[PDB]
Design a protein around this ligand. Structure first.
Ligand SMILES: Cc1sc2c(c1Cl)[C@H](SCC(=O)O)NCN2
Ligand SMILES: *[C@@H]1O[C@H](CO)[C@@H](O)[C@H](O)[C@H]1NC(C)=O
Length: 354
C-alpha cells in the first residue's frame, strides 16, 4: 500500500466518464530517478464497445472507484529483493482510464459520450509532478505494459519535448515499452471480435482524436497514423532511448491473430504460423539495441513480483536494464543490453514463466 493516489488538480483532464484522472506516487527523497508506469488493458473504439467496457471494466474508464493506495510490485517495488534495478526510485503508477492506448486528446462534450485523454493525462501528470520533486530529476523513465507499453512508444518523445519547453533540459527522458510491440500480421484464421487491430486502431484514432509522434505522423500522413501504433514502425522515428521488452509469442498478439492453444497436438499449419511469428518478431528487434525478448508464450513482465526470474542467454531483465543504464552514462563486458532468444518455439527458454 506504498503508492498513494493523487487525483489531478486540473480536473479537465479526465478518465473516459469525466471523472478526474490521477496517479499513484511513492516518493524517494534520496533519489533523482523517476519511474512513471503506464498501465495497460486493451482499448475501446466505438460507443457500443465502450459502453460494454463501462459495465464490466469500469476502473479502466473512471476513477470513481479507485482505491486510495496501491502496492508497488516488480519494477515498481521499493524492495531490492524484488526490484534489483530501481528499488530506490521515485515510483509513479498512472492508471489507464482513457481506453485509447494513451493516444487521445478529446474531452467529453455534447458531441462525445466519453473523453479520450490519454496523451493529455501523461502530460498533466508530468506537469503536476514537477512541483513534487520531478524538477530535480536526472532520469525520467516512462515505462508501461501492454497497451501501456505501446503508450510509451507514442508518448516518450512528447514528454521529452514537454520538459524541454518547460525549461528542464537536464532531465533525461527514456522509455521502457513492455509487451506493447505488436505485428500487423495476417491472422491464423480470419474471423468488435472480428475487427483486427489495424482496423480497430484506425477507427479508434478518429473516435479518440488520437495523436501520434510527429516524425512518425509526417512519414505516414493523414489517414495512415494507425501505423504509428506498431512498434517496429514508430520506434525508428523516436529520439529518446527506448528499451523494448517483448515475449516472442505474446498472448495478446496470439489472441488478435485468432490462435488458441488447448492441449491437442499442434498441426503443421499452426506450427509454421507460430514459428513464423517468433521469427518475424525477432527480425523486427534486430536493430533495436536495448531489448529483452524471451521465447515464451506469456503476457507482460515488468510489474509482476517474479519479474526477476526470466533470463535470456543467462541475463535477467533487471540486469539488462542496469546494463542499459550503464550504457547511457562501446559495449560493456558481461553487461549486455540486446537479449533476443533465437530458439523457435514457446518455452524453448527454460526460464519462461509457468
Ligand atoms: C496497437 C495494438 S495492437 C494490439 C494491441 C495494441 Cl494496444 C493489444 S493491447 C493488449 C493489452 O493491453 O493487454 N494487444 C493485441 N494487439
Ligand atoms: C488543464 O488541462 C487542459 C487540457 O490539457 C489545458 O488546456 C489547461 O490549460 C489546463 N489548465 C491548467 C490550469 O493547468
Amino acid at each position: 500500500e506504498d503508492l498513494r493516489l493523487h487525483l489531478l488538480l486540473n480536473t479537465s483532464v479526465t478518465c473516459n466518464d469525466g471523472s478526474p484522472a490521477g496517479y499513484y506516487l511513492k516518493e524517494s527523497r534520496g533519489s533523482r530517478r523517476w519511474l512513471l508506469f503506464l498501465e495497460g488493458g486493451w482499448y475501446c473504439f466505438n460507443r457500443e464497445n465502450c459502453d460494454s467496457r463501462y459495465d464490466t471494466m469500469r476502473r479502466l474508464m473512471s476513477s470513481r472507484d479507485w482505491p486510495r493506495t496501491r502496492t508497488g510490485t516488480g519494477i515498481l517495488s521499493s524492495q531490492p529483493e524484488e526490484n534489483p534495478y530501481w528499488w530506490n526510485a521515485n515510483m509513479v503508477f498512472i492508471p489507464y482510464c482513457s481506453s485509447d492506448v494513451w493516444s487521445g486528446a478529446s474531452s467529453k462534450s455534447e458531441k462525445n459520450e466519453y473523453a479520450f485523454m490519454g496523451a493529455l493525462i501523461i502530460q498533466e501528470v508530468v506537469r503536476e509532478l514537477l512541483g513534487r520533486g520531478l524538477s530535480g530529476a536526472k532520469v525520467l523513465l516512462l515505462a508501461g505494459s501492454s497497451a501501456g507499453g505501446t503508450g510509451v512508444l507514442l508518448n516518450v518523445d512528447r514528454v521529452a519535448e514537454q520538459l524541454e519547453k518547460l525549461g528542464y533540459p537536464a532531465i533525461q527522458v527514456r522509455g521502457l515499452a513492455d509487451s506493447g510491440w505488436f505485428l500487423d500480421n495476417k491472422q491464423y484464421r480470419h474471423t468488435t471480435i472480428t475487427c483486427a487491430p489495424t482496423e480497430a486502431i484506425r477507427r479508434g484514432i478518429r473516435y479518440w482524436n488520437g495523436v501520434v509522434p510527429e516524425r512518425c505522423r509526417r512519414q505516414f500522413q493523414e489517414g495512415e497514423e494507425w501505423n504509428c501504433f506498431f512498434g517496429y514502425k514508430v520506434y525508428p522515428t523516436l529520439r529518446s532511448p527506448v528499451f523494448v521488452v517483448q515475449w516472442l509469442f505474446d498472448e495478446a498478439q496470439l489472441t488478435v491473430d485468432n490462435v488458441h492453444l488447448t492441449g491437442q497436438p499442434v498441426q503443421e499449419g499452426l506450427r509454421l504460423y507460430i514459428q513464423n511469428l517468433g521469427r518475424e518478431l525477432r527480425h523486427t528487434l534486430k536493430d533495436v539495441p536495448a531489448s529483452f525478448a524471451p521465447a515464451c508464450l506469456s503476457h507482460e513482465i515488468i510489474i509482476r513480483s517474479h519479474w526477476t526470474d526470466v533470463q535470456v542467454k543467462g541475463t535477467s531483465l533487471p540486469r539488462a536494464l542496469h546494463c542499459w543504464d550503464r550504457s547511457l552514462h562501446t559495449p560493456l563486458k558481461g553487461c549486455p543490453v540486446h537479449l533476443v532468444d533465437s530458439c523457435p518455439w514457446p518455452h524453448c527458454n527454460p526460464s519462461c514463466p509457468t
